[PDB]
Amino acid sequence: GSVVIVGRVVLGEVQVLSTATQSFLGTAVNGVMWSVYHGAGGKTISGPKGPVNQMYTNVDQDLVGWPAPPGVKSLTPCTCGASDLYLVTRHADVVPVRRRGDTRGALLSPRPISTLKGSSGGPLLCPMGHVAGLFRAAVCTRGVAKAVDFVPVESLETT
Ligand SMILES: CC(C)(C)[C@@H]1NC(=O)O[C@@H]2CCC[C@H]2OC/C=C/C(F)(F)c2nc3ccccc3nc2O[C@@H]2C[C@@H](C(=O)N[C@]3(C(=O)NS(=O)(=O)C4(C)CC4)C[C@H]3C(F)F)N(C2)C1=O
Numbered sequence: 654g655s656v657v658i659v660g661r662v663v664l665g666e667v668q669v670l671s672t673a674t675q676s677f678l679g680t681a682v683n684g685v686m687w688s689v690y691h692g693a694g695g696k697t698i699s700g701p702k703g704p705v706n707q708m709y710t711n712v713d714q715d716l717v718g719w720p721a722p723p724g725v726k727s728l729t730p731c732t733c734g735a736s737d738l739y740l741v742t743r744h745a746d747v748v749p750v751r752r753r754g755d756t757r758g759a760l761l762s763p764r765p766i767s768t769l770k771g772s773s774g775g776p777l778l779c780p781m782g783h784v785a786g787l788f789r790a791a792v793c794t795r796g797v798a799k800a801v802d803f804v805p806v807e808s809l810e811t812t
């Protein structure tokens with residue numbers, strides 16, 4: 654009934670989040686751990702200090718957020734306007750992406766969908782290591798990922 658922190662990806666650190674049936678990622682920005690609604694639902698984030706309710710919940714945008722747990726450092730938002738980005742997966746893979754719009758990025762080389770599965774909520778990073786977006790969905794054809802869809806970092810604000 655809650656989301657648990659089961660691991661992390663060391664870049665800053667991306668959180669590996671899991672429910673009873675699904676595992677995905679969480680990215681802390683502006684004091685908030687952001688993730689995807691299709692993974693966490695409206696569930697709380699659990700831990701030794703007790704469950705903590707989501708402070709942001711947007712079903713339409715597939716975006717949820719909790720107050721950053723103690724110790725979860727926030728990543729710096731990208732302000733350099735880069736279009737050459739890097740998707741960080743739950744396996745610590747860093748996949749180059751060319752931004753082609755406000756929420757879309759093309760992959761330089763198609764990757765099987767199985768290799769991106771479970772990395773929703775992970776960050777897209779600019780060449781400076783700053784978070785430009787948050788992995789939400791993949792453009793899939795013949796089971797091969799050719800592009801990604803992400804929540805822009807600008808939408809990851811407190812209010
Ligand atoms: C074909 C496909 C790849 C399955 C699918 N593509 C797709 O739909 O592309 C279209 C065209 C371009 C953008 C997108 O427009 C529709 C928007 C979908 C959405 F994302 F906004 C979304 N909003 C929701 C809001 C509320 C409740 C449920 C929602 N469900 C959604 O979408 C669903 C979920 C999302 C997903 O699987 N994301 C990833 C992932 O890893 N998840 S996960 O960790 O393993 C896991 C399931 C444990 C949590 C990162 C991609 C990985 F697999 F590469 N989906 C389906 C897809 O990506």
Ligand SMILES: [Zn+2]
Nearest residue numbers: 731732733779
């Ligand atoms: Zn940047």
